Coordinates of C-alpha atoms in Angstrom, one line a residue:
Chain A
X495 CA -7.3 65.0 -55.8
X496 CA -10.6 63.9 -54.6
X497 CA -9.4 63.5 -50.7
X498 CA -10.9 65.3 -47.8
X499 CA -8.5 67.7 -46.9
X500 CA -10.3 68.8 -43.5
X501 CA -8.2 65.9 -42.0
X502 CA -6.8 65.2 -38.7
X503 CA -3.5 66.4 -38.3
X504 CA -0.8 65.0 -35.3
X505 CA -2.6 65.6 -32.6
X506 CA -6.0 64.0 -33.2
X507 CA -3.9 61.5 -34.6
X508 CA -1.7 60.8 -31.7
X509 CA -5.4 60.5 -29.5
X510 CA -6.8 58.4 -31.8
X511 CA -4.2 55.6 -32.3
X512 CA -3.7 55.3 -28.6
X513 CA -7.0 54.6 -28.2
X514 CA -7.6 52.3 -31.0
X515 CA -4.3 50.3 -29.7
X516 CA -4.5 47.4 -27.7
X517 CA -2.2 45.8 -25.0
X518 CA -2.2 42.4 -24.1
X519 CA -2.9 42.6 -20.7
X520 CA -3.8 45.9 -19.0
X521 CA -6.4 45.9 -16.9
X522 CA -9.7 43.8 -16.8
X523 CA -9.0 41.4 -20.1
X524 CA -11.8 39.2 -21.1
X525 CA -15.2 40.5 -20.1
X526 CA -18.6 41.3 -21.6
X527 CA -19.8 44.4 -22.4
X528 CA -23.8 45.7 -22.7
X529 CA -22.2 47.6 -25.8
X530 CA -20.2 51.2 -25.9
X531 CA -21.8 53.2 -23.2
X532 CA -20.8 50.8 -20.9
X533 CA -17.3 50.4 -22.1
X534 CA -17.3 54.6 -21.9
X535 CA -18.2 53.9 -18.0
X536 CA -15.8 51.3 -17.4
X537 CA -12.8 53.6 -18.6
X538 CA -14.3 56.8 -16.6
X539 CA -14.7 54.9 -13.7
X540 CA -11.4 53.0 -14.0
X541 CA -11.6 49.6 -13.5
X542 CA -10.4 49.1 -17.0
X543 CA -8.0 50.9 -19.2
Chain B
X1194 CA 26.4 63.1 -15.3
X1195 CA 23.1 64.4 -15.6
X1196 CA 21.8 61.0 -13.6
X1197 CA 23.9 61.2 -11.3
X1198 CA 22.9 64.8 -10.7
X1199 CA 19.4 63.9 -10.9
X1200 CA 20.0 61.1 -8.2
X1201 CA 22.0 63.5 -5.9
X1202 CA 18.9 65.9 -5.8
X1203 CA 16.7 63.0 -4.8
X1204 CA 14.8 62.9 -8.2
X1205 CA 13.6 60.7 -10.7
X1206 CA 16.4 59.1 -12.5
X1207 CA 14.3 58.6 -15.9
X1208 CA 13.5 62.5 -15.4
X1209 CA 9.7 62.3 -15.9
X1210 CA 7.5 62.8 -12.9
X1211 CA 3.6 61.7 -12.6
X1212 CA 1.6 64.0 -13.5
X1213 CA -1.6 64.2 -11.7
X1214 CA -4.5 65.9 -14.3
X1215 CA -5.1 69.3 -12.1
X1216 CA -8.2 69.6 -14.1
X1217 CA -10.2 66.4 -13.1
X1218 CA -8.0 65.2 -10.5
X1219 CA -7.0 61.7 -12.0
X1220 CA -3.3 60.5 -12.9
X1221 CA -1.8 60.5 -16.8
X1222 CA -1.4 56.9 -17.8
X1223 CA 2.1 57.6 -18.6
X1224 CA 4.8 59.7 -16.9
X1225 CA 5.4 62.9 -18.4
X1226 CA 8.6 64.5 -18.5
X1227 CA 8.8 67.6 -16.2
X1228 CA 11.9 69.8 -16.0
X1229 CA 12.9 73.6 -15.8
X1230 CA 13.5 75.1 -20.0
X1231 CA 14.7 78.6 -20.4
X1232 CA 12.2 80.4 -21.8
X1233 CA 13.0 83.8 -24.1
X1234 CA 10.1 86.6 -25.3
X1235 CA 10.4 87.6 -28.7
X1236 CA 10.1 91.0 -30.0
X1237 CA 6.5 90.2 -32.2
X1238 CA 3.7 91.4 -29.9
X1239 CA 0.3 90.8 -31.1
X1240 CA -0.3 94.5 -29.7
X1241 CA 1.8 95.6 -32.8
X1242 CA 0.8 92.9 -35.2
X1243 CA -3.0 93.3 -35.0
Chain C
X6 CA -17.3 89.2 -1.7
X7 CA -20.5 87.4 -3.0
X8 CA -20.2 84.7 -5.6
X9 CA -22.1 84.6 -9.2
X10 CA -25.1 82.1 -8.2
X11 CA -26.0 80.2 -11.7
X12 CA -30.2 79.8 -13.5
X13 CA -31.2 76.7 -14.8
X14 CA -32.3 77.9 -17.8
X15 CA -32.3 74.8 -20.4
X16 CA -33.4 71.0 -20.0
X17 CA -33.8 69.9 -23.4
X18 CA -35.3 66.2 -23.2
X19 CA -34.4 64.1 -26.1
X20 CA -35.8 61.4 -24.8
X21 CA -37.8 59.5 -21.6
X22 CA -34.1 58.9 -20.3
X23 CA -32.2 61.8 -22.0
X24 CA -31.4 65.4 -20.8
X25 CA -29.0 67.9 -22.0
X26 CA -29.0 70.3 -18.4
X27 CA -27.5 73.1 -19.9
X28 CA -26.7 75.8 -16.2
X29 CA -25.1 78.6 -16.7
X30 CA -23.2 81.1 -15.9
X31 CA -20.9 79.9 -13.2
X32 CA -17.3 81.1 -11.8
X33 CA -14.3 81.0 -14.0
X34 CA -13.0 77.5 -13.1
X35 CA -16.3 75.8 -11.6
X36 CA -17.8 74.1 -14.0
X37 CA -15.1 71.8 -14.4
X38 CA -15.1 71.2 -10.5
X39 CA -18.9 70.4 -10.3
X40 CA -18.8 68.4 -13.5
X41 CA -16.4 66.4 -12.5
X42 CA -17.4 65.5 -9.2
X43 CA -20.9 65.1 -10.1
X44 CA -20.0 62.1 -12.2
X45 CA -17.6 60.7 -10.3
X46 CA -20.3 60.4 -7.8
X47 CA -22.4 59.4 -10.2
X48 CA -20.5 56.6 -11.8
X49 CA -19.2 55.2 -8.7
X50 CA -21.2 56.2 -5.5
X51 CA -25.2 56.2 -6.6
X52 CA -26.8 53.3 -5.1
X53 CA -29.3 50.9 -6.7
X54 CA -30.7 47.7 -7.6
X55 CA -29.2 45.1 -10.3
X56 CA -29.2 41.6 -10.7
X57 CA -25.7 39.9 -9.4
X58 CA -26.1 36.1 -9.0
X59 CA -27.7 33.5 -11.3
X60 CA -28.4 30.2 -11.7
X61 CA -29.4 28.1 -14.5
X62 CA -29.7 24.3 -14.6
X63 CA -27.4 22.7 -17.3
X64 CA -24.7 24.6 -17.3
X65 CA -21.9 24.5 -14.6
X66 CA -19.6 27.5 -15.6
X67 CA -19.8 30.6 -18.8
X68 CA -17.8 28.4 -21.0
X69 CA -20.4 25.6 -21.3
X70 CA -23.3 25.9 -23.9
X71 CA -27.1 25.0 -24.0
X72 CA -29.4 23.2 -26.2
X73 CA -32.5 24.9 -27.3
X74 CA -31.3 28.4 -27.9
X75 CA -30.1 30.8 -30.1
X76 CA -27.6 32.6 -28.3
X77 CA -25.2 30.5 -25.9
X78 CA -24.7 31.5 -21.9
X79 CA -22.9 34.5 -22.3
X80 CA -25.0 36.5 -24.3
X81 CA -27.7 34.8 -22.1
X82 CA -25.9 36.7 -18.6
X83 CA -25.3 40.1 -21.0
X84 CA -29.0 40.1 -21.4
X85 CA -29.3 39.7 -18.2
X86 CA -27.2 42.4 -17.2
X87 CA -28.8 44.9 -19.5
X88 CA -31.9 44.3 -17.4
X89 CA -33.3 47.0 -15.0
X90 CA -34.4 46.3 -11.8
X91 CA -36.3 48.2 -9.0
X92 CA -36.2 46.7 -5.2
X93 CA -37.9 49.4 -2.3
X94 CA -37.9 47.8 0.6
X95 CA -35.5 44.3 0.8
X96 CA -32.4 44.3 -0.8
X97 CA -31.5 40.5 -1.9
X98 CA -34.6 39.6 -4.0
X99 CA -34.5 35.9 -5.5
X100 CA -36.7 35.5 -9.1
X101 CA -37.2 33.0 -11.1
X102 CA -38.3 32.8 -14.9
X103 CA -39.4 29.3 -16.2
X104 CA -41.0 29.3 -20.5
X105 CA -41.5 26.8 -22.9
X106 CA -42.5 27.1 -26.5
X107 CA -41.2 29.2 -29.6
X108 CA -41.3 33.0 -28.3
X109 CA -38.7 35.5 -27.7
X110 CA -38.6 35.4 -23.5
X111 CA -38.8 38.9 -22.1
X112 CA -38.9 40.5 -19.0
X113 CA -42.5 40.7 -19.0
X114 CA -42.7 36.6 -18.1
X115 CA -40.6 36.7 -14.9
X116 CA -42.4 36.7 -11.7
X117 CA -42.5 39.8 -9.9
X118 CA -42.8 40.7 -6.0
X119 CA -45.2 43.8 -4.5
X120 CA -42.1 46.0 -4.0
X121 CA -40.0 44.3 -7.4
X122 CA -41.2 45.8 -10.6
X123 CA -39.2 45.6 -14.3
X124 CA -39.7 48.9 -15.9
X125 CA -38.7 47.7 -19.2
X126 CA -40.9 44.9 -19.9
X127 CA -39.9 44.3 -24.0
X128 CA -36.2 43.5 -23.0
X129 CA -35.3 40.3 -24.8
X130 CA -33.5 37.9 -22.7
X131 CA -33.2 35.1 -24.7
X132 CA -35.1 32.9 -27.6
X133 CA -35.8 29.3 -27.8
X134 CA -35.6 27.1 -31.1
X135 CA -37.3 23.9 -29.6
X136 CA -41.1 24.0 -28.4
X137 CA -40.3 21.4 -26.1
X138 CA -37.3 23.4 -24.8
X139 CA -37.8 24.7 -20.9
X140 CA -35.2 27.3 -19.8
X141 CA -34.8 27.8 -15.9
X142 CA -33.0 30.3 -13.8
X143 CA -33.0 31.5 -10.9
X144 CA -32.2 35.5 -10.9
X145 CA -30.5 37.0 -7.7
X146 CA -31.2 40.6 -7.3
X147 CA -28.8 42.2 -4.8
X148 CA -28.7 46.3 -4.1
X149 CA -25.5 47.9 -3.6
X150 CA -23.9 51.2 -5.4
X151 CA -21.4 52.1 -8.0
X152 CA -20.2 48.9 -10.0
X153 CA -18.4 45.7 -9.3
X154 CA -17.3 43.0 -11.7
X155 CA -17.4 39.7 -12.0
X156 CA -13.4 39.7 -11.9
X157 CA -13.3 41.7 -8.6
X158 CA -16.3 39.7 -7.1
X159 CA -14.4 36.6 -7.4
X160 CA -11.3 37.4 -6.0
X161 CA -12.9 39.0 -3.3
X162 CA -15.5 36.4 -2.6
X163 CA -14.0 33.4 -0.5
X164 CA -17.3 30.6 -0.1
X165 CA -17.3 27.9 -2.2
X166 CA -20.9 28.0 -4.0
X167 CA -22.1 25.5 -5.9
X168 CA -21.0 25.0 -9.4
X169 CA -23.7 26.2 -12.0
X170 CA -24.1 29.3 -9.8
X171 CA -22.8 32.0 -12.8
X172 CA -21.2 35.5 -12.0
X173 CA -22.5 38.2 -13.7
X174 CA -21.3 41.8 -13.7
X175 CA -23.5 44.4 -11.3
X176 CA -25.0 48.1 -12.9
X177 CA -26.1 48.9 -9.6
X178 CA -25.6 52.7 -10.6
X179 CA -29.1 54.0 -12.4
X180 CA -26.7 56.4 -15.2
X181 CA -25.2 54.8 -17.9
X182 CA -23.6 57.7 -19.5
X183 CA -22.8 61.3 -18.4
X184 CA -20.2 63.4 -20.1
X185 CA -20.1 67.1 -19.1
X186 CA -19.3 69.7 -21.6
X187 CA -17.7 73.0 -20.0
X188 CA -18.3 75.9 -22.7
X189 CA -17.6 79.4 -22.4
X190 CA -20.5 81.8 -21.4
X191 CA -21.1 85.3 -20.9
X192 CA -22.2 88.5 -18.5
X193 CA -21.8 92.2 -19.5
X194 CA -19.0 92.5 -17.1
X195 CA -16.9 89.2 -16.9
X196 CA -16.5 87.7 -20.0
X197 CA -14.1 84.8 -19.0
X198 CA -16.8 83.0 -17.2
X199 CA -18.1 79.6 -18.7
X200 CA -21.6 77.4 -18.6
X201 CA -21.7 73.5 -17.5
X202 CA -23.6 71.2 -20.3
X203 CA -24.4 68.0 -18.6
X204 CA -25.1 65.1 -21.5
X205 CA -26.9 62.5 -19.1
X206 CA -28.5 59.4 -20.0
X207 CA -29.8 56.5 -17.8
X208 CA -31.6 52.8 -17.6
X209 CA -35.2 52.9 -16.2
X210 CA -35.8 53.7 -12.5
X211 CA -34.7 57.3 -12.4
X212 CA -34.9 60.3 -14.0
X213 CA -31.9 62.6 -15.3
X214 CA -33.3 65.2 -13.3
X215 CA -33.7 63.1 -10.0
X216 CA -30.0 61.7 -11.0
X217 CA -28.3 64.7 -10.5
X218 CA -30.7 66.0 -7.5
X219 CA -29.8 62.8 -5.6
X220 CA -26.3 63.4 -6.7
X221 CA -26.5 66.7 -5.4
X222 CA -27.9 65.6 -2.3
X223 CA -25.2 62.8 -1.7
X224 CA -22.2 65.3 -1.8
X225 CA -24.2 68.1 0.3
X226 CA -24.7 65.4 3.0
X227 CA -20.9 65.0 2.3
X228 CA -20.1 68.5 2.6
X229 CA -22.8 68.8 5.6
X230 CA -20.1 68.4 8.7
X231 CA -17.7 71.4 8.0
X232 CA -20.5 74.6 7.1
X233 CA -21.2 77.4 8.6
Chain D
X6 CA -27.7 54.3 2.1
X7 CA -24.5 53.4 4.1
X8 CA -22.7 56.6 3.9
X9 CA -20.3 58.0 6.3
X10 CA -19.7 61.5 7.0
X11 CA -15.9 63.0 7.6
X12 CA -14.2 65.2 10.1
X13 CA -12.1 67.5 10.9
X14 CA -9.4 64.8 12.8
X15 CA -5.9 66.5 13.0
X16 CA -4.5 69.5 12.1
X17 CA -0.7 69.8 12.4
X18 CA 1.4 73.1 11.6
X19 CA 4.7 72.1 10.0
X20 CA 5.9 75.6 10.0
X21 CA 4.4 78.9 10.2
X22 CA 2.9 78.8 6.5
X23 CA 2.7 74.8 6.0
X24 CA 0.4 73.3 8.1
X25 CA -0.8 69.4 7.1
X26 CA -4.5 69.0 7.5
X27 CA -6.3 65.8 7.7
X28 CA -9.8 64.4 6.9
X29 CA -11.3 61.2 8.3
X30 CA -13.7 59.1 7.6
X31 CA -14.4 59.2 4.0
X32 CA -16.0 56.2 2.0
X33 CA -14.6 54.3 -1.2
X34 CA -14.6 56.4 -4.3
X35 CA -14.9 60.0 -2.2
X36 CA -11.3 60.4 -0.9
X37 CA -10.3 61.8 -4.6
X38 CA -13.6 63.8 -5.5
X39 CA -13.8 65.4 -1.8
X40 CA -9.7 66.2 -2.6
X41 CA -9.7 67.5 -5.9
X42 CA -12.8 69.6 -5.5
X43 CA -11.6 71.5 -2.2
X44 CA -8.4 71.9 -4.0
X45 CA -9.4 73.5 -6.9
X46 CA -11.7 76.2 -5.0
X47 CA -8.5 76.6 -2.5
X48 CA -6.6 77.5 -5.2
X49 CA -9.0 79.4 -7.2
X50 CA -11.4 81.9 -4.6
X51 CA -9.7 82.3 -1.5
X52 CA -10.0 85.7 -0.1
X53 CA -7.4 87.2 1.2
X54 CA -5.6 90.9 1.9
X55 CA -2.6 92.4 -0.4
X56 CA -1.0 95.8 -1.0
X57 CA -3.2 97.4 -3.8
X58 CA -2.0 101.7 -3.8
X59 CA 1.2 102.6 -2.8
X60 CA 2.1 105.9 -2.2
X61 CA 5.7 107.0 -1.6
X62 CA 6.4 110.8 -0.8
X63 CA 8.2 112.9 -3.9
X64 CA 7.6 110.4 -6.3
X65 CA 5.9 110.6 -9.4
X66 CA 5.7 107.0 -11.6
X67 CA 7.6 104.0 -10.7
X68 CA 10.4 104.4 -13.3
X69 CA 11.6 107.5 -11.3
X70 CA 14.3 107.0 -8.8
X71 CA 14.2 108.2 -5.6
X72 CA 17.8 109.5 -4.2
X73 CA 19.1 107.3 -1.0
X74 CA 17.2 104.5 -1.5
X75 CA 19.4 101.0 -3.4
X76 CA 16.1 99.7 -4.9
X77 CA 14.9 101.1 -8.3
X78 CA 11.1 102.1 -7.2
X79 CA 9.8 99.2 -9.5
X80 CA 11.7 96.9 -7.2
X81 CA 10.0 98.2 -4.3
X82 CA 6.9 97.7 -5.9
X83 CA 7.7 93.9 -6.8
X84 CA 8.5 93.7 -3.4
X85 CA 5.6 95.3 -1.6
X86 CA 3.5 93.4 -4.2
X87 CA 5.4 89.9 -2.2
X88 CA 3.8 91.9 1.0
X89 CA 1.6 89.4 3.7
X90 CA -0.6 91.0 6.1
X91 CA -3.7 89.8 7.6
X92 CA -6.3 93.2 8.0
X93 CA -8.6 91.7 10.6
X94 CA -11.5 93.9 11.1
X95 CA -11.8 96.2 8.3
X96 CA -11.4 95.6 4.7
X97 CA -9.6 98.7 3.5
X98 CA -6.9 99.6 5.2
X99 CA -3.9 102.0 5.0
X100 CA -0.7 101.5 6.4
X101 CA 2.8 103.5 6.8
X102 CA 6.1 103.2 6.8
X103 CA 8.8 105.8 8.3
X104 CA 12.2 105.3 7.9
X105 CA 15.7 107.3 7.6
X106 CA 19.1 106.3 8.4
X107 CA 21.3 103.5 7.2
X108 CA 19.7 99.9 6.9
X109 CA 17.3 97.3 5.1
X110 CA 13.6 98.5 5.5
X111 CA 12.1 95.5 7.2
X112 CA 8.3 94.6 6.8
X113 CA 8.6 95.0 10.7
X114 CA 9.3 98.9 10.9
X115 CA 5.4 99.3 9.1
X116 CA 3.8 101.7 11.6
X117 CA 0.5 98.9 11.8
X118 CA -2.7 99.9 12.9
X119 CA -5.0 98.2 15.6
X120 CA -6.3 95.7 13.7
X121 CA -4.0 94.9 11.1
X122 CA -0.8 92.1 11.5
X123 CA 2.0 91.7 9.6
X124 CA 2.7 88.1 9.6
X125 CA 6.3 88.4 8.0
X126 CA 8.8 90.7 10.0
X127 CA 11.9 89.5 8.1
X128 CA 10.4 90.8 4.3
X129 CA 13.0 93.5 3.2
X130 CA 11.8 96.1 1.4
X131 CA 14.5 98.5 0.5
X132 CA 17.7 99.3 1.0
X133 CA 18.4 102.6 2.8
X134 CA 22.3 103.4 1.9
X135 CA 22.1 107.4 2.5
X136 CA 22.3 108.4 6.3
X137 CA 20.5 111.4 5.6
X138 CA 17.9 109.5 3.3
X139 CA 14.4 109.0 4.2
X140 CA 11.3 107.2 2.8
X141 CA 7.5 108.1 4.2
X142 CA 5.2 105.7 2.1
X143 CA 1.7 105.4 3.0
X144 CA 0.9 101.7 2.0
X145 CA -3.3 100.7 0.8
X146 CA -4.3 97.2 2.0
X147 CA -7.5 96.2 0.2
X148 CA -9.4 92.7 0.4
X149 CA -10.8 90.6 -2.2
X150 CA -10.4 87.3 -4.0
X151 CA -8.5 86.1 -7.0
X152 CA -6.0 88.6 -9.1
X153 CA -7.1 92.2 -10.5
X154 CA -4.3 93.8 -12.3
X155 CA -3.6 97.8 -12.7
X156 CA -5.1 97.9 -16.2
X157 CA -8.7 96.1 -15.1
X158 CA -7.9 99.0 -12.0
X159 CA -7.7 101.4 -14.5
X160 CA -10.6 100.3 -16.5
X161 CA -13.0 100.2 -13.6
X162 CA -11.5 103.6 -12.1
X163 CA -14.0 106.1 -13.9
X164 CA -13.3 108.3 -11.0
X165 CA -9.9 110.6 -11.3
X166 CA -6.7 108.9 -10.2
X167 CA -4.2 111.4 -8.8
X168 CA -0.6 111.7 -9.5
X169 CA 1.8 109.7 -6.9
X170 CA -0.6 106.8 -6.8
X171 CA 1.5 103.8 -7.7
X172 CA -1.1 101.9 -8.7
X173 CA 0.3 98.2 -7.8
X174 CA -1.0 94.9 -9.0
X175 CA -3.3 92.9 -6.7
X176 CA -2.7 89.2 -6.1
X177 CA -5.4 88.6 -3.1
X178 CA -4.8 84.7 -2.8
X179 CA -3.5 83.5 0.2
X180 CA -2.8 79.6 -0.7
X181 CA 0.5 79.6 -2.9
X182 CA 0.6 75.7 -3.4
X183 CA -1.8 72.5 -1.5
X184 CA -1.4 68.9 -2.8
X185 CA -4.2 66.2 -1.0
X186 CA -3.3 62.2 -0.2
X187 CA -5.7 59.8 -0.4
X188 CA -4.4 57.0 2.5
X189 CA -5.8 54.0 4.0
X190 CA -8.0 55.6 7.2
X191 CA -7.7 53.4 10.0
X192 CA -11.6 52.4 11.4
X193 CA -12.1 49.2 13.6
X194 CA -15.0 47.6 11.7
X195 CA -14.5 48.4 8.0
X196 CA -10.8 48.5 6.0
X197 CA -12.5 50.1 3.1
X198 CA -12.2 53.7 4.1
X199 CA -10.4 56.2 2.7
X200 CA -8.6 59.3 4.8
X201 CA -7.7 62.7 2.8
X202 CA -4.5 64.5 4.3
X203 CA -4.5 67.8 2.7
X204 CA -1.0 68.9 2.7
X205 CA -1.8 72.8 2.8
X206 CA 0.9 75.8 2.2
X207 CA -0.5 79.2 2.8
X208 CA 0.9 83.0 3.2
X209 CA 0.7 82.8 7.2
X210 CA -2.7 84.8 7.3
X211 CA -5.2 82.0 6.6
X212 CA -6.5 80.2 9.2
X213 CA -6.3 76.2 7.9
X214 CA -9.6 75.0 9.4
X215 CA -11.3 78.3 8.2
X216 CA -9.9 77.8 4.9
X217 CA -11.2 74.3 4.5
X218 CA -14.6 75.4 5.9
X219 CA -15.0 78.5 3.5
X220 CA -14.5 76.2 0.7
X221 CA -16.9 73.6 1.7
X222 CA -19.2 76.9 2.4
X223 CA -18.9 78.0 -1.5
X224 CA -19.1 74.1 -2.7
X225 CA -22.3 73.8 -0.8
X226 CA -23.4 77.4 -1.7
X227 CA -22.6 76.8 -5.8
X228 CA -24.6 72.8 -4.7
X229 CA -27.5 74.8 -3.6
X230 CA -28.5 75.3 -6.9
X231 CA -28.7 72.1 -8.2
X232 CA -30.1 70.3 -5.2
X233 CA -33.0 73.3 -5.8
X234 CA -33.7 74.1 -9.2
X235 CA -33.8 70.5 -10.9

């Protein structure tokens, strides 16, 4: 069937949903962001999760 | 029992320690569970399979 | 017992604030060390200028709105964030930007000291829909190093300024993004070596190269009590 | 530029082979990149001496067994592998052990040289059971860094290799297990410092302070090369 079978299998998977999850109050809720590099710094750095 | 054994021997009771990344020095966001497992060594060595 | 000392051997610019500093070979194990240390330093110990404290008459706090404009007061403060700043000798630098008319206000407009230059002059701040509208601020630029929100500025902050006065989030790192990538290189002899791949790109100000150099510098001054 | 440069403060030997060594001042955000850094080279390239050729008199591989002796020879191997010395001025050394009668041979009857000191008198060796047994090995201390098997021996041997040469496996890292804490350091005009406590646990030859100053040697040595070139 016309599906890609080059798929992410359990692992990639179990990354990839707990980073596209989302708590309701973790650490540093509600600010503004200059776009995804900056949200790729504030994780590495760790003032938000 | 195995509580109880685990809070004679002045461990964690939930039996997961916190894992500090020994790569890049940070801490996992979750505890992991760390214990001794018995290990065997099968009789398939890649020395006679390849 | 001499180590393996590594060649520079790749700096592939992709753009004026890109660099892919590809250095190999190292120790089995080392890359990963001076990777990661070089952007912890980076993300959290390079010092620099950024704007940190401005006010705009009209408004009184981030949730309040203003006539005249196409984006609203948050987007206003993002914009304001994303701007780069220079400071070389002070380091609290007070700036103001006053326009009126239809135009998209850049950085270009602001006033600008002998030591204060903007080295991206096309950033868009804002845009006005009114020609008789006349947008004011007044643009603190602080210097410290790393980065600080507006969350932890607050609640560490104890004066009571006056209301209008908005918090805005500090940059006062120059990188914006560096993610090493440890591969696996090879000599004759040792095969299990591997070769450090540093992805680093930055704002105006500074160089990649200069990035890590300084970086380099700050943990050898570190390192500089307990040598040989 | 408001940096701060650490110390050397305290350094305070637990036992023998734990010894706690601190580090003070250190600024906000340096504490765990100064600790994870020096723990990482600690663990990986520390040189150190070990037990590399052993060879024991009327003995041909180590799956023989020798008559008078408890120990299967691969045992003593295992445990002369678990050997500690500390060669101080040379860096290829060879050692002996005599020893008849009844009793444990004791890492203390080695017949040491000048310059070379056990550091663990209490490591049994063998097991003598025979009063007329007897055991004359003549025990090859080499000094290097990291681990180099019998096979990568074997491999870089293109010279012969005689027979009686137990050819034991080489693991030339002193520092068996060092965990760092990043505390609140105690300075009279700021409270945002950061003190590192290295919480070290060596063989007993290391020197503590020489260990930490080797590795910020190699850190600087490896930074060399970045501060240059780029």
């Amino acid at each position: 069937n016309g599906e890609p079978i080059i798929v992410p299998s359990q692992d990639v998977v179990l990354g990839l949903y707990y980073m596209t999850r989302d708590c309701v109050n973790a650490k540093g809720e509600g600010m503004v962001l200059t776009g995804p590099k900056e949200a790729e710094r504030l994780y590495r750095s760790g003032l938000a999760s | 029992e195995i509580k109880e054994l685990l809070k004679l021997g002045d461990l964690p009771t939930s039996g997961q320690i916190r894992l500090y990344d020994g790569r890049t020095g940070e801490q996992f966001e979750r505890p992991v569970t760390v214990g001794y497992m018995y290990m065997l060594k099968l009789n398939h060595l890649v020395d006679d399979k390849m | 017992t001499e180590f393996l000392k590594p060649r520079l051997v790749d700096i592939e610019q992709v753009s004026s604030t890109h660099a892919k500093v590809t250095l190999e070979p190292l120790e089995r194990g080392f890359g990963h060390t001076l990777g990661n240390a070089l952007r912890r330093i980076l993300l959290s110990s390079m010092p620099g200028c950024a704007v940190t404290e401005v006010e705009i008459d009209g408004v009184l706090h981030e949730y309040s709105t203003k006539e005249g404009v196409q984006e609203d007061i948050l987007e206003i403060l993002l914009n304001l964030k994303g701007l780069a700043v220079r400071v070389q000798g002070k380091d609290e630098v007070i700036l103001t930007l006053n326009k009126s008319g239809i135009g998209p206000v850049t950085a270009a407009d602001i006033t600008h000291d002998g030591d204060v230059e903007i080295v991206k002059p096309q950033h868009v701040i804002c845009h006005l829909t009114d020609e008789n509208a006349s947008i004011s601020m007044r643009i603190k630029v602080q210097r410290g190093r790393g980065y600080v929100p507006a969350s932890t500025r607050i609640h560490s902050e104890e004066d009571e300024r006056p209301i209008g006065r908005l918090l805005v989030d500090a940059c006062y790192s120059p990188v914006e993004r560096i993610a090493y990538n440890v591969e696996a290189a090879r000599v004759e002899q040792r095969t299990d070596l591997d070769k450090l791949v540093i992805e680093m790109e930055t704002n105006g100000t500074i160089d990649p190269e200069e990035a890590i150099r300084r970086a380099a510098t700050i943990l050898a001054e570190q390192l500089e009590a307990f040598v040989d």
